[model samples]
Target: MERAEILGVGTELLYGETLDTNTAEIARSLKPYALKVERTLRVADEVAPLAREVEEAFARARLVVLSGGLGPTPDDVTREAVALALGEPLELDEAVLGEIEAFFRARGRAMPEANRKQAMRIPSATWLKNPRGTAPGWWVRKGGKDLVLLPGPPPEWRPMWQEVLPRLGLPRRPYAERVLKTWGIGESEIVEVEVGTYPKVHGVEVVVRGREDRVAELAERIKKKLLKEVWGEGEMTLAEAVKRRMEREGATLSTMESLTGGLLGAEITRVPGASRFYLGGVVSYSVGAKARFGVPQDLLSRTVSAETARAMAEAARSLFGSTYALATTGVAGPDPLEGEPPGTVYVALAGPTGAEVRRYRFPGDRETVRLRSVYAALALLVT
Candidate 1:
């Protein structure tokens, strides 16, 4: 499994109406087979352009995986495009037509006439049965190259992909991977290995890949190198790491939010068994609400200040009777708030030792600021 290109076909993708999540999903899924995604491209739902794209992409890569444009609509021209690209005409598959018709009949409905097109296939292509959808997947193998066409919906395509993996007939090799997530850790500090460092909004992710034993060795070395900053690993969030620490220490947490509304609480609770550590939280967005819930009236005058954040943290801990509490206050805006620019955030933590606050002039729009503030609060808790 190598030299693969993901070609996502949909006008909505180019229009920014639909995100091309399937391409990344396919690329990630291919990794365990020692497959690498060489390139990825998106095109609108025109047959000529899509055929051209498919032809060119297949010419370069040994495998071209396509998603979308396989629906029962006029814009669903994936089959036609594929046939045109391969210089093969579409032929109806009676078996697939029967399957599609059976799907509708089981639901006490008749198959629409337009769905008949989904039963068509090009030469050298094998139909992959899809019980979840009308459009069956297609696998084209010719001249040592391959083309895999899957339906747009994740529910349908994902299962089909998993089932067809063993039959892919590639020179499959053993693969292993581990992701080490760390906050406030720069890429320069990491020593090179079979790894890739990806910078994200909250922190950096160090991905280690190779054979099973090699992956384990690299992960150990990386974890030892960044022991303190490593919050969690492989799909673990900063909040989950905080929850794990608090659970081990028999600690409870509370939160008072000004900028993030209830998003901070939402992230913390996204982790399973978070109730063991998280007491509760308040989204005191309005000035009066902040004053009534936690912050002092005098501090309410400068809602986005460090004093207000510290006051909120202390008040929440006292009110909720928790071992620790976190607070956030920020100006997330295109316009300034009380002369403070957008992304001017203050995150405060109150623990048994005392209380501490950190001010940050983060960059990005309102959503970014809010999300970053939540991450900052979690990072503070773990540290």
Candidate 2:
């Protein structure tokens, strides 16, 4: 297997101020090259520590990738660190310098003197063109090892890495991956029923990774087997699946949220063409607000139950003049309400067929309970 390592260079990463997502992106992209990432390291912006980490990574892996610390600021020392680690002197690439100048000039601004640092490169390194930003990357090959330096920002780093990977001439193998999104079912149950028998009998990887198009076949088989539980595949969200279904049926949806606030509406509207099928929603968080939405005042006063959720959904459908409506009512708090404990949730869906209610005792704190309630409401619509 081709082994590689990643280094994220920034004091903010070390201090936990900024998340190091570049490492994960790089690792995912390297999968096609059959490059297995053995280690991921983070280093401060200081030259000494960054250079030391680079040297250590180079000693362990043939390909060492570094991200961040390539800006115009004083703390941006990735270039200097790579040069020092490789025992190479920095030199300015006139072409890169001209490009950097033109980038600022195109915006009707003069390039700062500090930006000149971005144009500097070591002798053994090849300049990697950055189409998105001023920070051009460095691709260094020395002593049978590869050191690739990329900028910190996602926009610049992603494209530059794509440009450089093909040039590296690494072995490429066809692979397939899929994500089967499901709700109302636990991972253990799915594993026991689908994965346990299918992988062994069908001779394929069920969840992820397979040679050629076998992964696609595996995905189809899994979907066929658990048709109801499998809502979608790959990056498709439950809300998107429901939106597609509603569009097919020529229907529109609205929501009334209490414990989940407006989270149900937010999820539904996250899709680009949601307005075609999603009318809107009401955040009837308080009893007065619930009553204002036409929910029965008696139901609101009694307790957070299936009756209240069903009424809320029916009221929202009528108020918004939608074909379908979803509602959520629960105690998502550190304290209980109406003799009900936290995580006690009720989700209801109102459609032309009839009104349906589901009672769930979810497990989590305030935010988790609220988020799960939103997911449960969307899942109910799809099912």
Candidate 3:
């Protein structure tokens, strides 16, 4: 099995100014190549330290993938670092320089002198074409180890990687992973089943490797044991699951959100073909907005309450002319609302039978409360 290490290079990434998504992308891309990610590291923009880190990483794994610091700016030192790490001299490639100049010329702009660094390459490295941006990536093989340097921006990195990855001649292995999404069940409940478990309260992911038959047998056994708890598999999200259910029942749904703002509607619309079952929604955020949605003013005078949630759901169901509706009313805050503490949330679902509301005192900041309320609303629809 091939082993790989990922390194993210940027001062901004170390300072939390930017999120490093490229590392995760590389790991996911390597999955089909049967490359096991052994370690992931983050380093600043300084060339010497980054070179040292690269040298150490190359010693540890068969492949080292680095992201960021491949831009035209002065702080972009990944090219220099990789050359230093490999003890190779940086040479300017005429073809790359011409392409970089053409890239700027096409935009009717003059190329800056500093951008010449982007055209530099090392003797042991192959230039990876970048169609989306000027910063071409580097693919190096030396000392029985491989190194791939990718740019920081997702738009540039993703396309360059797609072009370069297939030509690396990596060994492929069969692997299978499945995500089982569930709700109204605790993680502890599933761990007692005695299978290799990685459990989340809302979703559990099961991974199996090796021969196809062996993987299928284990996956089937695990699925059978947890069948009742499972709602959907793989990339199926909560909103998607609910939408499918609504479609099967030939029902349409709408939402009235308060503490969650328009988050419930946003979640619903994230799934394609949602228009088939999702009608629309109202972001009844303020007391006046709630009253406009048929939530009584008297109900809002007190605080965030279950009655308000029920009223909102009923109003949405009637206004949208849908078979079902969901509503959220909560105190998602750093301070109390009408003497009610933060994270005091109520979710309601209205159907032909009537409306049902559930109260929850979740724990977290404002955003967490809002997210939980959105998921709770979707859970009510599915469960």
Candidate 4:
């Protein structure tokens, strides 16, 4: 089996300013064919970093998938790096230039002179046409090794990876992937109880070393133990699971988010036809704002209790005219509030089944705590 490695060429990612989601997107695209993504590397958007990373990718994997640095900007160095790595020169291809020009023309704009760089390709590389974006992907082969370069914008990269790359005779490998979601479980406990069982499973592999390997195995084991609880697996995210459940139950839901700051709404809206089920959301980040959404003054003064949570839920249910309403009120902290510690949260749900609330104290910075609150809110609704 050919080992595949994803090389994300960008400085923003290495510096922690941006995340390299392209690798995950690429990995999911190739999963059906069972391509093994053994490694992923993110290098700064400079020639030396790109050159070194590509060399490392070529050394370890039979296939090197590169994303980013294929744009019109001078900073985009993937093309130059590939040429340097292969000891070839970047050459302008007239056909690719025409395609680039056509892209700008169709959009009622003139192609910038800088964008001409997008037409350059390695001497022996095959171009992958990107219908939706300006940068075209390229595929190059040398010494029995293959390198695939894709444009980095997720919308462009995802489709070319799925629709274009497969047509290039890439060898198919049979692989199965499962994404197991566990709510209210700390990452540490997830490691402790479920991590060690994967190697013994019939067919699966963990991407990380040590405890991660164990956790991956444990997740697969959980899938077997609670097949119904597992919901969807293998690249299916939590929102997908929730959407499927809502479709089955014929239920629509609204949200009242405070500490989460509309994140819960964002998660649900990622589903394709979410408008049919996701009525709307209320962002009540302050006590005043909470009151605006119907959190009574008495409730605010009393406590951030389950009762307050249930009130917010009902308020949203009535205001949005949704069949069900979910509300989250929490203190996400670098500091504490309302005499409760940071990470203290109250999530409530109201529906035909009645109303209920769950209290949580998540540990992390403000953003992490807020995100966890969203996950908790969704999990509460599902269970």
Candidate 5:
């Protein structure tokens, strides 16, 4: 098994200004072949720190993959850092310069003089063309280990990793993974399930692929085992599964969300052909909006009970003339709402089949808790 480490090189990453989405893409891309990512490091763009991190990664893993800081700006330092890490002197390559110049000319623009540095190549490093951007990728090897330097921009990074790397003889192998999207389940509770104990599951890596399909599954058995918490197989999302089920049953749906803002609508809209099944939604962020939407002030004052949730769901369905409606109301905040904690959430589903309300005390900041609450509501509708 080949062990790999991913290093995100940029000061922007440490400041929380930019997301390292490329790391997740790279991990998923290599998962099926059982190439394990041993560690992930986020280093500032300074040459010294980036070089030290690269050296440490090479010390522990056979493959070191880096992304970011490969632009024309002076702050971009990945090329210099990698050169220093390998003790190789940087030299300009005429071939890369020609390619870079042609890239600009083809787009009807003059190549900036600063971009000439993008043509530099260290000894023994091969340049990989980036069709989407100016910064090309680098593939270098030393001591029988491999190092790949990819541009930070996702449009460039993803395709260079997926489409270009294979042509350079990077050892082809089949890779696959099973991703489970569970609602009303905490990560720690999931850890308690000891999901890693499954047979023939060693050398397999499991992780949260975020709110998207970021993996490939090659076998049905692996798919079935993962279905314990997985609502749908092979990159299927909870909202997508719900949409399919609604179509199968000839139903339509709507929502009344509070703390989640319009995120429920956002998720549903992500599903293709959603306009057919999605009736509409309302963001009831205040008690005034709740009252206008049919939740009585007396009920809200008396208690934030299951009846409140049920009524809200009923109101949305009636307002949109839909077969089913989902509603979520919650206290998501740094402070409490009506004495409720930061994560107190309530969800309800109402249809011809009747009404159901589920309450949960989720753990996270205000936005995450609200988002998870929306997932919980959809999970009920999915089942």
Candidate 6:
């Protein structure tokens, strides 16, 4: 495993003025290949100080990755900083300059004279093409250490980093990954293997890592152990799982919301091809709005209960003529509503047989209550 250090360059990045989301992107992207991010730093765009930072990073870690300060302005001193750090002189690459010129030409503008600085590279460095922007990146190796300097923008650096990965001798190694998402199970209960475990909003995640065959062997065993609790895998969400099942059965769904507003409908439609199985529904957010939709006005004026949720689901199913309907009603509050405390929730699913209502007291504020209700309704449909 190689230890890597990330250096983010920009004055705005200092004192948390600008968030450097690229550090996390690089660290997480290389994690599966067992590349450990040993340290991270942020520096302003000054040649002497930035160059010193680069030298210090290379002294500690085998790989030093730098981002930002690669533009045409005098403040963009990353190329000069790296060259200064290595005690090497800057040399211009005409090929990169031509590409930079073409980029501005395609946009119906002349290349700025300052942009000529963007084509400079130090000795013992290879240029990485940046199709998204004018600043081509640099890859360097000296002695036993490696250095990579990339453009500031996430869009430019992301694609450049993807091209740099295969050359790091990482992808050729024996590496494999499997992510298992389990619901209705405590985070501690899913710890049968020495895998990465996380408590997600709608489920617990178990990440299995090893050689390809070994990962498959352990993942299968763990899946069987927590068979009933496992809802999906990898990037699969509960809504997507429901969509897959409903599409297979040729079933259509509609939603009715009160406590969750339009959140339930939003979750279902987030899945691509949702129009095939989703007929959409009403967001009866207010007590009066519920009466206008399908819920009885009497039920709203008196109390919000499981019966009201069931009525909403049934009415929505009939109104949209969908095979199934999901409804959410209750108190999503920082205080209380209709004498009910916060976290009080009722999720109902109306299907061919009838409607089934489940009550829950989800913790957290109003946002959590609504989000939890949507996940619970989707879980009900999948089960």
Candidate number with greatest lDDT? 1
**Alpha-carbon runs more than 4 Å astray in model 6:** 9-21, 32-36, 44-48, 59-62, 67-146, 149-160, 171-175, 188-193, 210-214
Tens digit per residue, CA lDDT, model 1, 1-26: 35888988899988779888988898
Candidate 6 whole-model C-alpha lDDT, 0 to 1: 0.86
Q: What's the lDDT for all of these models? A: 0.87, 0.83, 0.83, 0.76, 0.76, 0.86
- Candidate 6 lDDT at 62 equals 67
TM-score, one value per model: 0.73, 0.79, 0.78, 0.77, 0.68, 0.76
Which pairs of residues collide in candidate 2? none
Name the lDDT of candidate 2: 0.83
**In model 2, where do residues sit more than 4 Å from their true spots?**
15-21, 55-62, 86-147, 153-167, 193-206, 210-219
lDDT of 5 by residue, 1-383 (tens): 77789988888888879987777778767654446776677788798888888877887776788999889888888888888888899899988888889999999999899999898879879887888888888888777878999988887877778865564344545433454444443444445511232211111223333212333323334445445654554467778888998999999999988878888888888889998899899998878888898877777663345778888898898889999999988777888878888888888999997999999887789778877777888888775
lDDT, candidate 3, equals 0.83
TM-score of 6: 0.76
Better model by lDDT: candidate 3 vs candidate 5: 3
Better of 1 and 6 by lDDT: 1
Instruction: Give the Cα error of residue 314 in candidate 4, in Å.
Output: 0.2
How far is 102's C-alpha from truth in model 3 (Å)? 9.1
What are the clash counts of all predictions, listed in order? 0, 0, 0, 7, 3, 0
lDDT of 3 by residue, 1-383 (tens): 76889999999888878887778878887876777887787899999999999988888888888999988787999999988988999999989888989999999998889889888999888888988888888888876778899988888888888887777777787655555666666657776712344654344555455555677777778778778777777777788888889889999999999888898999999899999989999998777777777877778785488888889999999999999999998799997888899989989999999999999888789988888788888888776
Q: Which runs in model 3 stand beyond 4 Å of their true positions?
A: 12-38, 55-61, 86-134, 141-145, 153-166, 173-175, 193-214, 243-253, 272-279, 320-323, 351-354
The Cα error of candidate 1 at residue 340, in Å, is 3.4
Which lDDT tens digits does candidate 4 get at residues 1-383?
A: 67788887788888768888887777766655545777678878898767877887887777789888887777888899888887888889888888888888988999899988988888879888887887899888777877899887888877777776666566765343445544443344444422331321111222222344464675666667545444344466667777887889898999998777888899889879998799898887777877887878889874467888888899899899888898988788877777888889998989987898999877778888887778778877664
The TM-score between candidate 4 and the true structure equals 0.77
Q: Judge candidate 4 at residue 86 and give its lDDT.
A: 79
Candidate 6 colliding pairs = none
